[PDB]
């Protein structure tokens, strides 16, 4: 494993990124809520906004707005479900 955190995606205890998600604070508290595993949902919603917005993903602007659908996503509103699997995985 890598970090240790709990999975905030299922509500469990998987291993976080241990590194900052991006430029702030902010990012400071998505490592150390997201794990290995809700990473890849990262990236789902990450397309959906792009494409929704239409963001420049070669700046920064199409990452710090997403910053905003995730932090008052969880730090936010707050939304905890208990799904998904645990996959195998590679490398």
């Given at each position: 494993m890598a970090r240790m955190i709990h999975c905030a995606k299922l509500g469990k205890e998987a291993e976080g990124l241990?590194?900052?998600?991006?430029?702030?604070?902010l990012g400071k508290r998505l490592y150390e809520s997201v794990s290995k595993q809700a990473w890849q949902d990262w990236l789902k919603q990450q397309t959906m906004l792009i494409n929704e917005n239409?963001?420049?993903?070669?700046?920064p602007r199409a990452r710090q707005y997403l910053m905003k659908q995730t932090e008052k996503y969880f730090f936010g509103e707050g939304a905890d479900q208990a799904s998904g699997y645990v996959p195998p995985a590679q490398g």
């Open positions: 241990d590194f900052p998600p991006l430029p702030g604070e239409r963001l420049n993903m070669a700046d």
